[PDB]
Amino acid sequence: MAHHHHHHMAKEDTIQMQGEILETLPNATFKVKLENDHIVLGHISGKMRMHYIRISPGDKVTVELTPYDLTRARIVFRAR
C-alpha cells in the first residue's frame, strides 16, 4: 500500500480539567460536570478511595483526562 503510515502515536499530553460533582457513583467513579457543561467520569484510583470521604454532589473537584480519552478521567483531589 502506497506510503502506508504506521499507527504509532507519540507525545502523550494529559489535561487537568476542573469542575464539580454532578452525581456520586459507588463504581469508584464520580460523574463530574466541568465548567464547559461537559460531563466526564472522574475515577478514583487506588484503595485510598475506600478510606477517602466519597465526594458528594455539589463539591467542586479537579480531574485529569487525556483529550482522546475525554469520556473518562482520573480524580485530582489536591492533597499536600
PDB file of N, CA, C and O in Angstrom, chain B, residues numbered from 101:
ATOM      1  N   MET B 101       0.858  -1.212   0.000  1.00  0.00           N
ATOM      2  CA  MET B 101       0.000   0.000   0.000  1.00  0.00           C
ATOM      3  C   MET B 101       0.888   1.255   0.000  1.00  0.00           C
ATOM      4  O   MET B 101       1.788   1.391   0.829  1.00  0.00           O
ATOM      5  N   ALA B 102       0.614   2.173  -0.953  1.00  0.00           N
ATOM      6  CA  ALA B 102       1.476   3.324  -1.278  1.00  0.00           C
ATOM      7  C   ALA B 102       1.665   4.294  -0.094  1.00  0.00           C
ATOM      8  O   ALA B 102       0.760   5.058   0.243  1.00  0.00           O
ATOM      9  N   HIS B 103       2.863   4.246   0.534  1.00  0.00           N
ATOM     10  CA  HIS B 103       3.271   5.174   1.615  1.00  0.00           C
ATOM     11  C   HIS B 103       2.352   5.025   2.847  1.00  0.00           C
ATOM     12  O   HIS B 103       1.987   6.011   3.486  1.00  0.00           O
ATOM     13  N   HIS B 104       1.988   3.764   3.160  1.00  0.00           N
ATOM     14  CA  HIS B 104       1.079   3.447   4.283  1.00  0.00           C
ATOM     15  C   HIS B 104       1.720   3.845   5.634  1.00  0.00           C
ATOM     16  O   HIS B 104       2.752   3.298   6.023  1.00  0.00           O
ATOM     17  N   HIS B 105       1.091   4.803   6.337  1.00  0.00           N
ATOM     18  CA  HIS B 105       1.622   5.338   7.606  1.00  0.00           C
ATOM     19  C   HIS B 105       1.275   4.421   8.788  1.00  0.00           C
ATOM     20  O   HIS B 105       0.142   3.962   8.929  1.00  0.00           O
ATOM     21  N   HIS B 106       2.285   4.172   9.631  1.00  0.00           N
ATOM     22  CA  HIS B 106       2.170   3.280  10.789  1.00  0.00           C
ATOM     23  C   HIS B 106       1.401   3.976  11.913  1.00  0.00           C
ATOM     24  O   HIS B 106       1.735   5.094  12.304  1.00  0.00           O
ATOM     25  N   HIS B 107       0.361   3.297  12.429  1.00  0.00           N
ATOM     26  CA  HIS B 107      -0.458   3.804  13.543  1.00  0.00           C
ATOM     27  C   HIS B 107       0.298   3.629  14.867  1.00  0.00           C
ATOM     28  O   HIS B 107       0.065   2.695  15.634  1.00  0.00           O
ATOM     29  N   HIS B 108       1.210   4.573  15.089  1.00  0.00           N
ATOM     30  CA  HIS B 108       2.101   4.622  16.237  1.00  0.00           C
ATOM     31  C   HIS B 108       2.162   6.083  16.682  1.00  0.00           C
ATOM     32  O   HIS B 108       2.929   6.880  16.142  1.00  0.00           O
ATOM     33  N   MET B 109       1.335   6.418  17.679  1.00  0.00           N
ATOM     34  CA  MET B 109       1.227   7.786  18.209  1.00  0.00           C
ATOM     35  C   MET B 109       2.399   8.090  19.164  1.00  0.00           C
ATOM     36  O   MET B 109       2.964   7.185  19.778  1.00  0.00           O
ATOM     37  N   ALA B 110       2.747   9.377  19.273  1.00  0.00           N
ATOM     38  CA  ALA B 110       3.844   9.871  20.137  1.00  0.00           C
ATOM     39  C   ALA B 110       3.431  11.199  20.782  1.00  0.00           C
ATOM     40  O   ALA B 110       2.499  11.860  20.325  1.00  0.00           O
ATOM     41  N   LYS B 111       4.149  11.579  21.866  1.00  0.00           N
ATOM     42  CA  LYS B 111       3.854  12.766  22.690  1.00  0.00           C
ATOM     43  C   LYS B 111       2.471  12.589  23.353  1.00  0.00           C
ATOM     44  O   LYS B 111       1.448  12.968  22.781  1.00  0.00           O
ATOM     45  N   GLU B 112       2.458  12.010  24.561  1.00  0.00           N
ATOM     46  CA  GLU B 112       1.234  11.916  25.381  1.00  0.00           C
ATOM     47  C   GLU B 112       1.058  13.232  26.147  1.00  0.00           C
ATOM     48  O   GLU B 112       1.985  13.704  26.807  1.00  0.00           O
ATOM     49  N   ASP B 113      -0.141  13.819  26.052  1.00  0.00           N
ATOM     50  CA  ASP B 113      -0.472  15.093  26.705  1.00  0.00           C
ATOM     51  C   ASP B 113      -1.829  14.955  27.403  1.00  0.00           C
ATOM     52  O   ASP B 113      -2.878  14.988  26.759  1.00  0.00           O
ATOM     53  N   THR B 114      -1.788  14.798  28.732  1.00  0.00           N
ATOM     54  CA  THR B 114      -2.988  14.708  29.575  1.00  0.00           C
ATOM     55  C   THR B 114      -3.317  16.124  30.105  1.00  0.00           C
ATOM     56  O   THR B 114      -2.414  16.946  30.264  1.00  0.00           O
ATOM     57  N   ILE B 115      -4.600  16.406  30.375  1.00  0.00           N
ATOM     58  CA  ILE B 115      -5.073  17.765  30.742  1.00  0.00           C
ATOM     59  C   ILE B 115      -5.868  17.680  32.042  1.00  0.00           C
ATOM     60  O   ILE B 115      -6.821  16.906  32.135  1.00  0.00           O
ATOM     61  N   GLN B 116      -5.481  18.477  33.055  1.00  0.00           N
ATOM     62  CA  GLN B 116      -6.271  18.604  34.278  1.00  0.00           C
ATOM     63  C   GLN B 116      -7.389  19.616  34.019  1.00  0.00           C
ATOM     64  O   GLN B 116      -7.136  20.781  33.715  1.00  0.00           O
ATOM     65  N   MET B 117      -8.630  19.142  34.145  1.00  0.00           N
ATOM     66  CA  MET B 117      -9.840  19.935  33.912  1.00  0.00           C
ATOM     67  C   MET B 117     -10.647  19.918  35.211  1.00  0.00           C
ATOM     68  O   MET B 117     -10.837  18.862  35.815  1.00  0.00           O
ATOM     69  N   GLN B 118     -11.115  21.082  35.634  1.00  0.00           N
ATOM     70  CA  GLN B 118     -11.714  21.278  36.972  1.00  0.00           C
ATOM     71  C   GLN B 118     -13.187  21.684  36.847  1.00  0.00           C
ATOM     72  O   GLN B 118     -13.531  22.613  36.116  1.00  0.00           O
ATOM     73  N   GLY B 119     -14.051  20.959  37.582  1.00  0.00           N
ATOM     74  CA  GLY B 119     -15.478  21.260  37.656  1.00  0.00           C
ATOM     75  C   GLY B 119     -16.056  20.922  39.022  1.00  0.00           C
ATOM     76  O   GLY B 119     -15.502  21.315  40.049  1.00  0.00           O
ATOM     77  N   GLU B 120     -17.178  20.188  39.039  1.00  0.00           N
ATOM     78  CA  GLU B 120     -17.951  19.888  40.254  1.00  0.00           C
ATOM     79  C   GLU B 120     -18.679  18.551  40.069  1.00  0.00           C
ATOM     80  O   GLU B 120     -19.049  18.197  38.949  1.00  0.00           O
ATOM     81  N   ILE B 121     -18.886  17.807  41.165  1.00  0.00           N
ATOM     82  CA  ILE B 121     -19.577  16.509  41.133  1.00  0.00           C
ATOM     83  C   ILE B 121     -21.068  16.726  40.806  1.00  0.00           C
ATOM     84  O   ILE B 121     -21.804  17.327  41.589  1.00  0.00           O
ATOM     85  N   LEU B 122     -21.495  16.223  39.636  1.00  0.00           N
ATOM     86  CA  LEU B 122     -22.913  16.204  39.239  1.00  0.00           C
ATOM     87  C   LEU B 122     -23.613  15.065  40.004  1.00  0.00           C
ATOM     88  O   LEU B 122     -24.712  15.240  40.531  1.00  0.00           O
ATOM     89  N   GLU B 123     -22.947  13.891  40.053  1.00  0.00           N
ATOM     90  CA  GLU B 123     -23.510  12.683  40.680  1.00  0.00           C
ATOM     91  C   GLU B 123     -22.403  11.774  41.245  1.00  0.00           C
ATOM     92  O   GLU B 123     -21.389  11.517  40.596  1.00  0.00           O
ATOM     93  N   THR B 124     -22.639  11.303  42.471  1.00  0.00           N
ATOM     94  CA  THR B 124     -21.824  10.314  43.144  1.00  0.00           C
ATOM     95  C   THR B 124     -22.233   8.915  42.665  1.00  0.00           C
ATOM     96  O   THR B 124     -23.420   8.596  42.603  1.00  0.00           O
ATOM     97  N   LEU B 125     -21.239   8.089  42.327  1.00  0.00           N
ATOM     98  CA  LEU B 125     -21.449   6.698  41.906  1.00  0.00           C
ATOM     99  C   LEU B 125     -20.569   5.772  42.774  1.00  0.00           C
ATOM    100  O   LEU B 125     -19.407   6.098  43.020  1.00  0.00           O
ATOM    101  N   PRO B 126     -21.109   4.600  43.252  1.00  0.00           N
ATOM    102  CA  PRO B 126     -20.340   3.613  44.062  1.00  0.00           C
ATOM    103  C   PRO B 126     -19.422   2.710  43.199  1.00  0.00           C
ATOM    104  O   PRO B 126     -18.876   1.721  43.688  1.00  0.00           O
ATOM    105  N   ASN B 127     -19.268   3.073  41.908  1.00  0.00           N
ATOM    106  CA  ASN B 127     -18.427   2.343  40.935  1.00  0.00           C
ATOM    107  C   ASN B 127     -16.957   2.804  41.014  1.00  0.00           C
ATOM    108  O   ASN B 127     -16.185   2.593  40.079  1.00  0.00           O
ATOM    109  N   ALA B 128     -16.578   3.444  42.157  1.00  0.00           N
ATOM    110  CA  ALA B 128     -15.238   4.040  42.383  1.00  0.00           C
ATOM    111  C   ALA B 128     -14.962   5.196  41.392  1.00  0.00           C
ATOM    112  O   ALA B 128     -13.822   5.622  41.207  1.00  0.00           O
ATOM    113  N   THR B 129     -16.041   5.679  40.771  1.00  0.00           N
ATOM    114  CA  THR B 129     -16.017   6.670  39.703  1.00  0.00           C
ATOM    115  C   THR B 129     -17.086   7.708  40.022  1.00  0.00           C
ATOM    116  O   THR B 129     -18.153   7.362  40.529  1.00  0.00           O
ATOM    117  N   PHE B 130     -16.810   8.978  39.728  1.00  0.00           N
ATOM    118  CA  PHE B 130     -17.733  10.081  40.039  1.00  0.00           C
ATOM    119  C   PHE B 130     -18.090  10.837  38.757  1.00  0.00           C
ATOM    120  O   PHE B 130     -17.217  11.173  37.957  1.00  0.00           O
ATOM    121  N   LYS B 131     -19.394  11.100  38.577  1.00  0.00           N
ATOM    122  CA  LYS B 131     -19.916  11.821  37.417  1.00  0.00           C
ATOM    123  C   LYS B 131     -19.705  13.328  37.653  1.00  0.00           C
ATOM    124  O   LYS B 131     -20.509  13.985  38.313  1.00  0.00           O
ATOM    125  N   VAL B 132     -18.593  13.861  37.090  1.00  0.00           N
ATOM    126  CA  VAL B 132     -18.160  15.252  37.314  1.00  0.00           C
ATOM    127  C   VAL B 132     -18.556  16.103  36.094  1.00  0.00           C
ATOM    128  O   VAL B 132     -18.209  15.777  34.959  1.00  0.00           O
ATOM    129  N   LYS B 133     -19.277  17.182  36.347  1.00  0.00           N
ATOM    130  CA  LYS B 133     -19.639  18.183  35.329  1.00  0.00           C
ATOM    131  C   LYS B 133     -18.582  19.300  35.347  1.00  0.00           C
ATOM    132  O   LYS B 133     -18.346  19.918  36.385  1.00  0.00           O
ATOM    133  N   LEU B 134     -17.953  19.551  34.198  1.00  0.00           N
ATOM    134  CA  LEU B 134     -16.915  20.589  34.074  1.00  0.00           C
ATOM    135  C   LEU B 134     -17.576  21.955  33.761  1.00  0.00           C
ATOM    136  O   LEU B 134     -18.764  22.016  33.444  1.00  0.00           O
ATOM    137  N   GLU B 135     -16.785  23.044  33.855  1.00  0.00           N
ATOM    138  CA  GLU B 135     -17.274  24.438  33.639  1.00  0.00           C
ATOM    139  C   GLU B 135     -17.804  24.669  32.200  1.00  0.00           C
ATOM    140  O   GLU B 135     -18.555  25.612  31.950  1.00  0.00           O
ATOM    141  N   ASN B 136     -17.394  23.789  31.269  1.00  0.00           N
ATOM    142  CA  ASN B 136     -17.844  23.809  29.856  1.00  0.00           C
ATOM    143  C   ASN B 136     -19.206  23.079  29.678  1.00  0.00           C
ATOM    144  O   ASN B 136     -19.675  22.899  28.555  1.00  0.00           O
ATOM    145  N   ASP B 137     -19.830  22.664  30.814  1.00  0.00           N
ATOM    146  CA  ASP B 137     -21.102  21.873  30.860  1.00  0.00           C
ATOM    147  C   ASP B 137     -20.901  20.433  30.332  1.00  0.00           C
ATOM    148  O   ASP B 137     -21.856  19.662  30.242  1.00  0.00           O
ATOM    149  N   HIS B 138     -19.649  20.088  29.985  1.00  0.00           N
ATOM    150  CA  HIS B 138     -19.281  18.756  29.502  1.00  0.00           C
ATOM    151  C   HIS B 138     -19.055  17.875  30.733  1.00  0.00           C
ATOM    152  O   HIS B 138     -18.190  18.167  31.558  1.00  0.00           O
ATOM    153  N   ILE B 139     -19.835  16.798  30.852  1.00  0.00           N
ATOM    154  CA  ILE B 139     -19.736  15.868  31.973  1.00  0.00           C
ATOM    155  C   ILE B 139     -18.800  14.701  31.602  1.00  0.00           C
ATOM    156  O   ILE B 139     -19.011  14.007  30.608  1.00  0.00           O
ATOM    157  N   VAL B 140     -17.768  14.509  32.429  1.00  0.00           N
ATOM    158  CA  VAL B 140     -16.774  13.433  32.312  1.00  0.00           C
ATOM    159  C   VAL B 140     -16.789  12.599  33.613  1.00  0.00           C
ATOM    160  O   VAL B 140     -17.137  13.106  34.679  1.00  0.00           O
ATOM    161  N   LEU B 141     -16.409  11.322  33.504  1.00  0.00           N
ATOM    162  CA  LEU B 141     -16.381  10.402  34.636  1.00  0.00           C
ATOM    163  C   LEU B 141     -14.977  10.381  35.290  1.00  0.00           C
ATOM    164  O   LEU B 141     -14.055   9.752  34.770  1.00  0.00           O
ATOM    165  N   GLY B 142     -14.834  11.078  36.437  1.00  0.00           N
ATOM    166  CA  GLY B 142     -13.575  11.130  37.186  1.00  0.00           C
ATOM    167  C   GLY B 142     -13.455   9.957  38.155  1.00  0.00           C
ATOM    168  O   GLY B 142     -14.080   9.952  39.216  1.00  0.00           O
ATOM    169  N   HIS B 143     -12.643   8.956  37.781  1.00  0.00           N
ATOM    170  CA  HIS B 143     -12.454   7.716  38.561  1.00  0.00           C
ATOM    171  C   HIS B 143     -11.323   7.887  39.585  1.00  0.00           C
ATOM    172  O   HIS B 143     -10.234   8.342  39.236  1.00  0.00           O
ATOM    173  N   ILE B 144     -11.584   7.518  40.856  1.00  0.00           N
ATOM    174  CA  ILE B 144     -10.539   7.497  41.898  1.00  0.00           C
ATOM    175  C   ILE B 144      -9.759   6.175  41.795  1.00  0.00           C
ATOM    176  O   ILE B 144     -10.339   5.095  41.908  1.00  0.00           O
ATOM    177  N   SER B 145      -8.438   6.274  41.581  1.00  0.00           N
ATOM    178  CA  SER B 145      -7.544   5.113  41.502  1.00  0.00           C
ATOM    179  C   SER B 145      -6.927   4.834  42.888  1.00  0.00           C
ATOM    180  O   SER B 145      -6.777   5.745  43.702  1.00  0.00           O
ATOM    181  N   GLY B 146      -6.573   3.559  43.139  1.00  0.00           N
ATOM    182  CA  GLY B 146      -6.017   3.136  44.426  1.00  0.00           C
ATOM    183  C   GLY B 146      -7.103   2.821  45.457  1.00  0.00           C
ATOM    184  O   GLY B 146      -8.228   3.309  45.350  1.00  0.00           O
ATOM    185  N   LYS B 147      -6.756   1.992  46.469  1.00  0.00           N
ATOM    186  CA  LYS B 147      -7.680   1.608  47.574  1.00  0.00           C
ATOM    187  C   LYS B 147      -7.898   2.772  48.568  1.00  0.00           C
ATOM    188  O   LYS B 147      -8.696   2.664  49.500  1.00  0.00           O
ATOM    189  N   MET B 148      -7.166   3.895  48.345  1.00  0.00           N
ATOM    190  CA  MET B 148      -7.321   5.148  49.109  1.00  0.00           C
ATOM    191  C   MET B 148      -8.781   5.623  49.100  1.00  0.00           C
ATOM    192  O   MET B 148      -9.273   6.172  50.086  1.00  0.00           O
ATOM    193  N   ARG B 149      -9.465   5.400  47.960  1.00  0.00           N
ATOM    194  CA  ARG B 149     -10.868   5.823  47.720  1.00  0.00           C
ATOM    195  C   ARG B 149     -11.859   5.293  48.772  1.00  0.00           C
ATOM    196  O   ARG B 149     -12.833   5.964  49.112  1.00  0.00           O
ATOM    197  N   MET B 150     -11.594   4.078  49.281  1.00  0.00           N
ATOM    198  CA  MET B 150     -12.465   3.419  50.273  1.00  0.00           C
ATOM    199  C   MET B 150     -12.339   4.133  51.630  1.00  0.00           C
ATOM    200  O   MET B 150     -13.330   4.371  52.320  1.00  0.00           O
ATOM    201  N   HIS B 151     -11.090   4.466  51.988  1.00  0.00           N
ATOM    202  CA  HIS B 151     -10.763   5.216  53.218  1.00  0.00           C
ATOM    203  C   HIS B 151     -11.105   6.716  53.063  1.00  0.00           C
ATOM    204  O   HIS B 151     -11.366   7.412  54.044  1.00  0.00           O
ATOM    205  N   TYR B 152     -11.095   7.185  51.812  1.00  0.00           N
ATOM    206  CA  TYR B 152     -11.325   8.591  51.454  1.00  0.00           C
ATOM    207  C   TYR B 152     -12.827   8.899  51.506  1.00  0.00           C
ATOM    208  O   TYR B 152     -13.655   8.072  51.123  1.00  0.00           O
ATOM    209  N   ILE B 153     -13.161  10.100  51.986  1.00  0.00           N
ATOM    210  CA  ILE B 153     -14.542  10.580  52.062  1.00  0.00           C
ATOM    211  C   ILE B 153     -15.090  10.759  50.633  1.00  0.00           C
ATOM    212  O   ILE B 153     -14.697  11.678  49.915  1.00  0.00           O
ATOM    213  N   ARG B 154     -16.011   9.853  50.239  1.00  0.00           N
ATOM    214  CA  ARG B 154     -16.698   9.874  48.932  1.00  0.00           C
ATOM    215  C   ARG B 154     -17.270  11.282  48.630  1.00  0.00           C
ATOM    216  O   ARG B 154     -18.004  11.856  49.434  1.00  0.00           O
ATOM    217  N   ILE B 155     -16.909  11.813  47.448  1.00  0.00           N
ATOM    218  CA  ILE B 155     -17.126  13.228  47.097  1.00  0.00           C
ATOM    219  C   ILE B 155     -18.603  13.448  46.693  1.00  0.00           C
ATOM    220  O   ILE B 155     -19.052  12.965  45.653  1.00  0.00           O
ATOM    221  N   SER B 156     -19.339  14.184  47.537  1.00  0.00           N
ATOM    222  CA  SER B 156     -20.796  14.385  47.419  1.00  0.00           C
ATOM    223  C   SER B 156     -21.155  15.325  46.224  1.00  0.00           C
ATOM    224  O   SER B 156     -20.328  16.158  45.851  1.00  0.00           O
ATOM    225  N   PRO B 157     -22.393  15.205  45.608  1.00  0.00           N
ATOM    226  CA  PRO B 157     -22.836  16.126  44.531  1.00  0.00           C
ATOM    227  C   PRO B 157     -22.910  17.582  45.035  1.00  0.00           C
ATOM    228  O   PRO B 157     -23.585  17.877  46.020  1.00  0.00           O
ATOM    229  N   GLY B 158     -22.199  18.480  44.333  1.00  0.00           N
ATOM    230  CA  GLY B 158     -22.089  19.880  44.733  1.00  0.00           C
ATOM    231  C   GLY B 158     -20.727  20.235  45.322  1.00  0.00           C
ATOM    232  O   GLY B 158     -20.515  21.377  45.730  1.00  0.00           O
ATOM    233  N   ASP B 159     -19.786  19.264  45.373  1.00  0.00           N
ATOM    234  CA  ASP B 159     -18.376  19.550  45.727  1.00  0.00           C
ATOM    235  C   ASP B 159     -17.569  19.770  44.452  1.00  0.00           C
ATOM    236  O   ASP B 159     -17.562  18.920  43.562  1.00  0.00           O
ATOM    237  N   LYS B 160     -16.885  20.917  44.365  1.00  0.00           N
ATOM    238  CA  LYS B 160     -16.007  21.233  43.235  1.00  0.00           C
ATOM    239  C   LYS B 160     -14.698  20.442  43.363  1.00  0.00           C
ATOM    240  O   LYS B 160     -14.102  20.383  44.438  1.00  0.00           O
ATOM    241  N   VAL B 161     -14.260  19.836  42.250  1.00  0.00           N
ATOM    242  CA  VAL B 161     -13.098  18.969  42.213  1.00  0.00           C
ATOM    243  C   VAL B 161     -12.414  19.079  40.841  1.00  0.00           C
ATOM    244  O   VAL B 161     -13.056  19.380  39.835  1.00  0.00           O
ATOM    245  N   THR B 162     -11.104  18.828  40.826  1.00  0.00           N
ATOM    246  CA  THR B 162     -10.314  18.738  39.594  1.00  0.00           C
ATOM    247  C   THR B 162     -10.180  17.250  39.215  1.00  0.00           C
ATOM    248  O   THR B 162     -10.160  16.384  40.090  1.00  0.00           O
ATOM    249  N   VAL B 163     -10.090  16.966  37.916  1.00  0.00           N
ATOM    250  CA  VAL B 163      -9.761  15.626  37.381  1.00  0.00           C
ATOM    251  C   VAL B 163      -8.708  15.813  36.262  1.00  0.00           C
ATOM    252  O   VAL B 163      -8.357  16.943  35.925  1.00  0.00           O
ATOM    253  N   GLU B 164      -8.214  14.706  35.695  1.00  0.00           N
ATOM    254  CA  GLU B 164      -7.164  14.722  34.668  1.00  0.00           C
ATOM    255  C   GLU B 164      -7.533  13.720  33.573  1.00  0.00           C
ATOM    256  O   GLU B 164      -7.665  12.523  33.830  1.00  0.00           O
ATOM    257  N   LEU B 165      -7.695  14.226  32.353  1.00  0.00           N
ATOM    258  CA  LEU B 165      -8.166  13.460  31.207  1.00  0.00           C
ATOM    259  C   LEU B 165      -7.280  13.708  29.990  1.00  0.00           C
ATOM    260  O   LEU B 165      -6.991  14.852  29.639  1.00  0.00           O
ATOM    261  N   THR B 166      -6.851  12.612  29.349  1.00  0.00           N
ATOM    262  CA  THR B 166      -6.315  12.647  28.009  1.00  0.00           C
ATOM    263  C   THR B 166      -7.452  13.128  27.080  1.00  0.00           C
ATOM    264  O   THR B 166      -8.583  12.668  27.236  1.00  0.00           O
ATOM    265  N   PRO B 167      -7.188  14.047  26.109  1.00  0.00           N
ATOM    266  CA  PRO B 167      -8.252  14.627  25.261  1.00  0.00           C
ATOM    267  C   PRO B 167      -8.916  13.540  24.387  1.00  0.00           C
ATOM    268  O   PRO B 167     -10.079  13.650  24.001  1.00  0.00           O
ATOM    269  N   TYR B 168      -8.126  12.490  24.094  1.00  0.00           N
ATOM    270  CA  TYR B 168      -8.565  11.318  23.323  1.00  0.00           C
ATOM    271  C   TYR B 168      -9.487  10.415  24.164  1.00  0.00           C
ATOM    272  O   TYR B 168     -10.388   9.762  23.637  1.00  0.00           O
ATOM    273  N   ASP B 169      -9.240  10.397  25.473  1.00  0.00           N
ATOM    274  CA  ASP B 169      -9.976   9.574  26.441  1.00  0.00           C
ATOM    275  C   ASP B 169     -10.920  10.475  27.255  1.00  0.00           C
ATOM    276  O   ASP B 169     -11.144  10.252  28.444  1.00  0.00           O
ATOM    277  N   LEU B 170     -11.466  11.501  26.574  1.00  0.00           N
ATOM    278  CA  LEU B 170     -12.369  12.531  27.153  1.00  0.00           C
ATOM    279  C   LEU B 170     -13.591  11.944  27.909  1.00  0.00           C
ATOM    280  O   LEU B 170     -14.147  12.593  28.795  1.00  0.00           O
ATOM    281  N   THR B 171     -13.993  10.715  27.543  1.00  0.00           N
ATOM    282  CA  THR B 171     -15.150  10.006  28.148  1.00  0.00           C
ATOM    283  C   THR B 171     -14.918   9.705  29.653  1.00  0.00           C
ATOM    284  O   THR B 171     -15.861   9.625  30.441  1.00  0.00           O
ATOM    285  N   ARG B 172     -13.639   9.542  30.014  1.00  0.00           N
ATOM    286  CA  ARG B 172     -13.195   9.149  31.360  1.00  0.00           C
ATOM    287  C   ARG B 172     -12.100  10.106  31.848  1.00  0.00           C
ATOM    288  O   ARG B 172     -11.576  10.912  31.078  1.00  0.00           O
ATOM    289  N   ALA B 173     -11.768  10.005  33.133  1.00  0.00           N
ATOM    290  CA  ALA B 173     -10.681  10.766  33.746  1.00  0.00           C
ATOM    291  C   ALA B 173     -10.197  10.066  35.020  1.00  0.00           C
ATOM    292  O   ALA B 173     -10.776   9.072  35.456  1.00  0.00           O
ATOM    293  N   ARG B 174      -9.123  10.607  35.604  1.00  0.00           N
ATOM    294  CA  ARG B 174      -8.648  10.218  36.935  1.00  0.00           C
ATOM    295  C   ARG B 174      -8.900  11.416  37.851  1.00  0.00           C
ATOM    296  O   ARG B 174      -8.631  12.555  37.467  1.00  0.00           O
ATOM    297  N   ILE B 175      -9.411  11.170  39.056  1.00  0.00           N
ATOM    298  CA  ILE B 175      -9.654  12.218  40.039  1.00  0.00           C
ATOM    299  C   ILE B 175      -8.328  12.924  40.414  1.00  0.00           C
ATOM    300  O   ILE B 175      -7.279  12.285  40.500  1.00  0.00           O
ATOM    301  N   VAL B 176      -8.399  14.238  40.631  1.00  0.00           N
ATOM    302  CA  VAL B 176      -7.277  15.040  41.104  1.00  0.00           C
ATOM    303  C   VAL B 176      -7.746  15.845  42.326  1.00  0.00           C
ATOM    304  O   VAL B 176      -7.974  17.052  42.243  1.00  0.00           O
ATOM    305  N   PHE B 177      -7.882  15.143  43.468  1.00  0.00           N
ATOM    306  CA  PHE B 177      -8.067  15.790  44.770  1.00  0.00           C
ATOM    307  C   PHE B 177      -6.684  16.259  45.255  1.00  0.00           C
ATOM    308  O   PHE B 177      -5.793  15.441  45.483  1.00  0.00           O
ATOM    309  N   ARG B 178      -6.513  17.585  45.412  1.00  0.00           N
ATOM    310  CA  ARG B 178      -5.200  18.178  45.704  1.00  0.00           C
ATOM    311  C   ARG B 178      -4.870  17.994  47.203  1.00  0.00           C
ATOM    312  O   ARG B 178      -5.319  18.768  48.048  1.00  0.00           O
ATOM    313  N   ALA B 179      -4.078  16.955  47.506  1.00  0.00           N
ATOM    314  CA  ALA B 179      -3.522  16.711  48.845  1.00  0.00           C
ATOM    315  C   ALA B 179      -2.121  17.330  48.943  1.00  0.00           C
ATOM    316  O   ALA B 179      -1.381  17.361  47.960  1.00  0.00           O
ATOM    317  N   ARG B 180      -1.764  17.822  50.136  1.00  0.00           N
ATOM    318  CA  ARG B 180      -0.425  18.374  50.423  1.00  0.00           C
ATOM    319  C   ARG B 180       0.565  17.211  50.696  1.00  0.00           C
ATOM    320  O   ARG B 180       1.743  17.451  50.958  1.00  0.00           O
TER     321      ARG B 180
END
